[PDB]
Every structure is written in C-alpha cells, then in structure tokens.
A paper describes a structure:
NQO1 constitutes an important enzyme of the cellular defence system and plays a central role in the activation of quinone-based chemotherapeutics. Among other functions, the dimeric flavoprotein is catalysing the conversion of quinones to hydroquinones preventing the formation of semiquinone radicals. Yet, another important role is the regulation and stabilization of various tumour suppressors like p33ING1b, p53 and p73. The broad substrate specificity of NQO1 allows the activation of chemotherapeutic prodrugs, like mitomycin C or β-lapachone.
The two most prevalent variants in the human population are NQO1*2 (NQO1 609C>T; NQO1 P187S; allelic frequency: 0.22–0.47) and NQO1*3 (NQO1 465C>T; NQO1 R139W; allelic frequency: 0.00–0.05), which are connected to a higher risk for specific cancers. The structure was determined to 2.1 Å and contains four protein chains in the asymmetric unit. The subunit structure of the R139W variant is also virtually identical to the wild-type structure with the exception of the amino acid replacement at position 139. The respective average rmsd in this case is 0.18 Å for a superposition of 230 out of 271 Cα-atoms. Preparations of the R139W variant showed the typical yellow colour indicating that the protein tightly binds the FAD cofactor in stark contrast to the P187S variant that was isolated largely as an apoprotein. The average of three measurements was used to determine the KD values for the NQO1 R139W variant as 155 ± 27 nm, which is 2.5-fold higher than the KD for wild-type enzyme. Thus, it can be concluded that the arginine to tryptophan replacement has only a marginal effect on the binding affinity of the FAD cofactor. The values for kcat and KM are virtually identical for WT enzyme and the R139W variant for both NADH and menadione again indicating that the single amino acid replacement does not affect the kinetic properties. In the case of the NQO1 R139W variant, we found that the crystal structure as well as the solution structure, as evidenced by NMR-spectroscopy, is virtually identical to the wild-type protein.
Numbering used by the authors:
A (entry chain C), B (entry chain B): 3 to 273
Amino acid sequence: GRRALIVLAHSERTSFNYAMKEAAAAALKKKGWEVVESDLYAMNFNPIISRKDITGKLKDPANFQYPAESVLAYKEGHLSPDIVAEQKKLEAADLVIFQFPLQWFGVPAILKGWFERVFIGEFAYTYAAMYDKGPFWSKKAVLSITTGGSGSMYSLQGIHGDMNVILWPIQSGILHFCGFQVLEPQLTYSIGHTPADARIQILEGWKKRLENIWDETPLYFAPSSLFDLNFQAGFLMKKEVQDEEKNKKFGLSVGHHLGKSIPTDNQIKAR
Amino acid sequence: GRRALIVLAHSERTSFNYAMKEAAAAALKKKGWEVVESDLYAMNFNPIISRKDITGKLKDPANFQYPAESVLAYKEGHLSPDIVAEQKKLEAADLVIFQFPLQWFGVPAILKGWFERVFIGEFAYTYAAMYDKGPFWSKKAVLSITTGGSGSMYSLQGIHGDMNVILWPIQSGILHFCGFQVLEPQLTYSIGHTPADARIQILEGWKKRLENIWDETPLYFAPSSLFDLNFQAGFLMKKEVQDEEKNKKFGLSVGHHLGKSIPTDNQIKAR
Ligand SMILES: Cc1cc2nc3c(=O)[nH]c(=O)nc-3n(C[C@H](O)[C@H](O)[C@H](O)COP(=O)(O)OP(=O)(O)OC[C@H]3O[C@@H](n4cnc5c(N)ncnc54)[C@H](O)[C@@H]3O)c2cc1C
Ligand SMILES: Cc1cc2nc3c(=O)[nH]c(=O)nc-3n(C[C@H](O)[C@H](O)[C@H](O)COP(=O)(O)OP(=O)(O)OC[C@H]3O[C@@H](n4cnc5c(N)ncnc54)[C@H](O)[C@@H]3O)c2cc1C
C-alpha cells in the first residue's frame, strides 16, 4: 500500500470539510492505503514562524533571519519537535490531500502557517533543485476546496474572476515549487447552498475519484528545462524557447501566460 | 490632516521590513499625517479564527459557522475586543499600508489571520456592498513587499511566473473586495542581495513616494457596474458587456482576463 496524508484546516467536526476528510480516509483505507492525518485545529498547531522553531543556539542571534537559521536547524536536527513530526509525515506520504474551506481567496491562516514552518529549505526545496526537480517529485498533491461563493462567481465572467488565477500561487508557488506533481483540485462550490442529496453525492464522488487518484494525469506546468536556472541568466526562459513561442497564440500556463491567452482551466483540468 | 494605519508582519526589529515600517511612519508624520501601527508580532496577535472570537453564547453551537456567527457578534457587540480594536484602527484610517516579506507567494500567516478575524462581514463587506461598492471605498490601501527572489524571477519569462498573478488574490480578493482603492504596490525584490548603499536608497525612495501617495492613480479593476450583482444571475458579467468585450483585444484585468491577453502590469502599474 501507498501512504496518504490528509491535512485538514477546519475546526468543526460538523463541517462539510470534516466530512470530506472522513470520506477520503475511508475510501483510501478500503483500497489498501495507510492514511495519516494532520487535523491542524485538533493539533492546536502553532502557525507562526519564529526563533522558537529552532531549539538551542542560533548562528546569529542578534540578527535573526528565519531562512538561514531554519535551514541550519534542519541539517543539524534542531527544529522544534512539532515541526519535525510534521516533516516525518510528509516524508512517509506518497499522496498529500489538503482539505480546507477557501478563506479570503487562499488557504486559512493555520494552513499557511503550516507551509511556512514545515516547508523548510533543503527539506522541501533548494534553488539547486526546484519545481519539477524538487524534493517532493515522487509525491502527488491535491487541493480539496469548499467555497461560499458559487462557481459562476469564479468563472471567466464572474465577479471574483478566474479561479485558475486564484489557485496558481498555491499549486505552482507552494506545491509544484517543492516538486509535487499537482492533481486536479476538487472544487466544491457554494456548499452552504447545496441540497442535502447533492451533498451526499459530492461525498460519494470524492470517494470514487480517490479509488484511482494515483493514476490521474497531473496539471500542466511549464517544465523547468525551458528556463536557464541560474542567477547570471536571472532564471529566465531560454532564448530559443521564447523564439519558438512567438508564433503561438496561447501561453504555457496561468503564471507563464507570456502576455497571451491563458490555456483554459490550466490550474483546474489536466491536459 | 489624514490618518494612516501601518500593518507590519515581521518578527524582527532588526529586519529591513521593520526599517521600511519606520521609514513610512516618519515620512508620513513629517507631512502631517496621523500614524497608527499594527505590529502583529509585537502585539502577539492571534491569527486563528475560532468560537472564542464571539464573547458569549453562539446562535447555533451545534453547527458552528464562522461567517454567520461573527457577523452576528459584530452587530451585537460580542466580538473579541482584540478584533474590535483592529476594526477601529481601520475605521479611522484613510490610508492603510501593509508591510511584509513575501512568504510562499502570499502574505505571512499572521497577516492572513488578521484579514480573516478582522475583515468580518457587514464591517468589511456584504454581497450588496462589495468591490467598488465596498465599505472601504473612501480608503486607499497599498502593499509594500520585500522578496528573496529577484525581479526577473517574477517577470513574464521568469521561473516563478508573472507577479501580477501573485498579487491578484490579495489586491482584488481581499483589499478591493472590501472597497479599498488599491495603489501601486511597493515591490522590493531580492532585498537579501542588495548592497548597503542601495538599501539606503530604497528607504529614501519609499519616503519620497509617500510624500504624495494620496495623489496617485489607483490600480484598475473591472467596475462592479459591469456585472449583474445578484444570485439569480450568478454575479456574471452583463450580457451587453460580454458582447461589447468580445471586440476588445485585452482582458479587463488579471482575474478578468476573459481568456485573452492580460494588460501589462495590471496589478503593478496604474493606467
Ligand atoms: C474568514 C473567512 C473567509 C472566507 N473567504 C471566502 C472567499 O474568499 N471566497 C469564498 O467563496 N468563500 C469564503 N468563505 C466561505 C467559506 O469558504 C465557506 O463558509 C466554507 O467553504 C463552508 O465549508 P464548511 O466545511 O464550513 O461547510 P459548513 O457550512 O460547515 O457545512 C455546509 C453544509 O454541509 C453539511 N454537512 C456537514 N457534514 C455533512 C455530511 N457528512 N453529509 C452531508 N452534509 C453535511 C452541513 O450540515 C451544512 O449544511 C470564507 C469564510 C470565512 C470564515
Ligand atoms: C517562510 C518563508 C517563505 C518565503 N517565501 C518566499 C517566496 O515565496 N518568494 C520569495 O521571493 N521570497 C520568499 N521568502 C524570502 C523573504 O521574502 C525574504 O527573506 C524577505 O523579504 C526579507 O525581508 P527581511 O525584512 O527579513 O530582510 P532582512 O534579511 O531582515 O534584511 C535584509 C538586509 O537589510 C538590512 N537592514 C535592516 N535594517 C536596515 C536599515 N534600517 N537600514 C539599512 N539596512 C537595513 C539588514 O542588515 C539585512 O542585511 C520567504 C521567506 C520565509 C521565511
């Protein structure tokens, strides 16, 4: 069996988010997965990066810089116990599910703090090995999101704008940057206005998808080989690559739109 | 005699972010501004939403729903006073400056939670009063952001992709949604690789800009008058507007790209 980690960011057992977490765990276990969860609220997880994330002496206590100090602590085994426990969950996991309600067009603060304290340099990323060469290359991640607003609001013509744009900083910036293959997000729009029978089927749909989740085609991101990955070239797209794209009508992705048309549902549907 | 609020999200008084906050306060005060600060770390601000944000019995404790419960607490005066104190800072402020290091392509968790606990419904937004009809329509907000990554990384051809996409969920989804006119963000790229002399100039340029900050043209967002703002129409773009926009080369904004070219630096430069 593969290993699954479910990171849940919701404080209520009675929420649809909790129900989705239970549905996921149940479905995966039946298919032979070992399932571990991170119920951040139940954990009362400390969401705030600080010098307390490092046990014992710092390298430069008078001028504390979290990136350098947290990296050093990781290498020397001096990270805070709660951080280390989470990192071990990540290392064991093949599939990571992030279950959360959309909050101010992003992840809840407690989940954002989880990323900030757990995704430490060298462990989760290096400038030498980033995006598709990232440490989590063998792992797959998926966002399971619930929203208050309807799907129409997040359509191209909706008042909020394209949901693909909202998803990008998370799926590309956080997950893919660390090497994750990112699967199509499970989007549950206006769950507060969804009829009872329909909420039941959404749960069943989620269970059914997870039966074959590992064999899905992941979302498309621009491969890192298209870029000159060094400070001298400023991590810019290769000259020959740019030349080849000048005849193309569509951009490569949401973030790499190149001033052209973004491919439809680049962050919502796989090729 | 206008009033400014500076929200800072950095743990270290020795940081450049703190220096930017200090420079902003002094520059504004010299021009006669009243300046109030929210140093979230120094305030030990709690960024995690919970039932205890309501200082009394809940309307529906068996099924706790934060949006409805927090709005009810707001109207009845049963919001936690640490939230109330922040809300009063916002009421008095004409200009709001958010000073923070870019962290995982968004705001630090402590600031995210600040938005989540303080921007309560009715106080900060309603489905009737949203975007340009929002409660903060008379106010202006600006992001002052420092990054570890270079500006080229966030260019159209950069490995991280377009920064305008990264800014959208914050500037449109959080700030503009509540009514704020959003001014051009102060972007300070690769501050960790900036020589001492250039760091001095960055501080001065920030001070110089703030001398006439209120006279600046705000960023462009699609006007809400272009949309049918009701649930029956799903808050979609008006039929006449859609047909008219079909003849426009560029999308309206980052989020309202409409599957077309995004206007250059829509979230970075004013028209
Ligand atoms: C601070 C904040 C910011 C927000 N920002 C945004 C935003 O930017 N955009 C946006 O769209 N929304 C936003 N929201 C709204 C938020 O996304 C929704 O309130 C949330 O997604 C609702 O999910 P829930 O899990 O709380 O469901 P709940 O509202 O708790 O439950 C929904 C329904 O599911 C039912 N249910 C529960 N368990 C089961 C089960 N086992 N089987 C069947 N039915 C069940 C419940 O009875 C309920 O009727 C925000 C909310 C907050 C508090
Ligand atoms: C969890 C996390 C996630 C991150 N995610 C991202 C990301 O997604 N993208 C990205 O690009 N970056 C990211 N970063 C990097 C981050 O954006 C930078 O570390 C941050 O912007 C640096 O700001 P600072 O104020 O800490 O600078 P500091 O490192 O504190 O200061 C830089 C220099 O300024 C000098 N200085 C301080 N005060 C003064 C003064 N008064 N006058 C002159 N000089 C002074 C200091 O001596 C120091 O040498 C992340 C960092 C963390 C910790």
